[PDB]
């Protein structure tokens, strides 16, 4: 509290650098973090950049106090329906401070294995920011913290964004996010599949990335898709299904998922229909970086 | 006969679809004719994975008059492509 600019701007750096050395005051790093928090709403906009960056760089902090930054909600209302420093920092004047905030959040989320689940909603909600840079940074941070995270109901919202005008960067970033996310519910996989199909049929230019994201989405968790095998590919029990076109880039898209999932689960070539075997041979011959070698009798 | 004139075709996907649409016909002689024709079109479609696959499929069957044509088409591609020859 020096009540003049250009002073606090570096006093914050000093408090951070001294604090990070050793946490022993009475709580020292927690106290310094609290001070930075109470400062994050500085009058200027130049200070807040350092404020955000430095607290982001910091890594060790008291858990219980950490969530008190995010504690205020319509988000918990939605969660029930299905069943403060950052709270203000995320929505600020100009996008520079938003970028700094998201970077700090990703850094300390990586640091702490917990506290991630608390921040997924705060990330996802902040997609329609209108600043493409913030868009991209939000997608990147979600990717970077995507581990041991669940989207029991967040799937639909984070996938709705997949339909952008061209936003080639945004849509590619969403595919990158999906290939590294985690889902737990079968209906979630089904939903993601259907929105991806809509994406492909509306923007027939990034199928080359749709296929890879589906490949990873299969390999990541195979068992989830096994119940879908009868339904996703038409296998009418006592009717011989007409060969679907071999080269259609929706049928190929849904086949690559199955084949990638099939490396793990041994039982499922039983579910595979008549065509799928020769079609698998054709795929494994065409796109050798999407479908791994399998145990199928046709290609021993 | 007119192989030199093949390269100067502006529209290739339509033509190849028409020619390839008769490889699924059950007739063992109609498959042999089409495999010969594909073999005669390696110059203008040397990287087509679907054609490569169909030839590699017909190469291991029970109908002599089509195996003796799949052999020809395979020898034809194996000159104008690499990823086909490796398989």
């Amino acid at each position: 509290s020096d009540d003049y600019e250009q002073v606090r701007s570096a006093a914050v750096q000093l408090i951070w650098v001294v604090s990070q050395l050793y946490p022993e005051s009475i709580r020292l790093v927690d106290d310094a973090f609290g001070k930075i928090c109470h400062m994050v709403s500085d009058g200027s906009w130049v200070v807040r950049v350092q404020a955000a960056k430095l607290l982001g760089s910091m890594e060790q902090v008291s858990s219980h106090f950490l969530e008190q930054t995010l504690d205020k909600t319509a988000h918990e209302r939605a969660k029930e329906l299905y069943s403060g420093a950052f709270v203000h920092g995320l929505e600020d004047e100009m996008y520079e401070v938003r970028i700094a905030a998201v970077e700090a959040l990703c850094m300390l989320a990586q640091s702490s294995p917990s506290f991630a689940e608390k921040c997924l909603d705060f990330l996802v909600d902040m997609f329609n920011d209108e600043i493409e840079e913030v868009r991209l940074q939000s997608i990147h941070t979600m990717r970077k913290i995507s581990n041991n995270i669940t989207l029991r109901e967040d799937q639909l919202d984070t996938v709705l964004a997949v339909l952008e005008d061209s936003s080639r960067d945004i849509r590619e970033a969403l595919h990158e996010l999906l290939c590294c996310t985690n889902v737990s519910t079968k209906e979630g996989i089904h939903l993601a599949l259907v929105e991806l199909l809509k994406n492909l049929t509306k923007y027939p230019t990034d199928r080359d990335s749709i296929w890879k994201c589906l490949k990873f989405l299969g390999s990541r968790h195979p068992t989830l898709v096994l119940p879908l095998v009868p339904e996703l590919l038409s296998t009418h029990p006592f009717f011989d299904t007409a060969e679907p076109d071999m080269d259609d880039p929706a049928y190929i898209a849904v086949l690559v998922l199955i084949f990638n999932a099939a490396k793990t689960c041994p039982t499922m070539p039983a579910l595979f229909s008549d065509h799928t075997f020769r079609h698998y041979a054709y795929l494994r011959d065409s796109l050798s970086h999407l479908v791994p070698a399998l145990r199928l009798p046709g290609r021993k | 006969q007119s192989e030199k004139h093949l390269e100067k075709i502006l529209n290739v996907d339509e033509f190849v679809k028409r020619i390839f649409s008769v490889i699924h016909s059950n007739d063992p002689v109609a498959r042999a004719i089409t495999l010969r024709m594909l073999g005669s079109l390696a110059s203008i479609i040397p990287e087509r994975k679907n054609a490569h696959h169909s030839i590699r499929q017909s190469l291991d069957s029970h109908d002599n008059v089509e195996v003796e044509a799949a052999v020809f088409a395979a020898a034809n591609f194996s000159a104008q492509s690499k990823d086909f020859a490796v398989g």
């Binding site: 007409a242 060969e243 071999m246 | 699924h24 016909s25 059950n26 007739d27 109609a30």
Partner: peptide, 14 residues
């Protein structure tokens, strides 16, 4: 219908 094209076969679109 189509005596040589087989009942279970990809249909020619055009």
């Amino acid at each position: 219908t189509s005596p040589s094209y087989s009942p279970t076969s990809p249909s020619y679109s055009p």
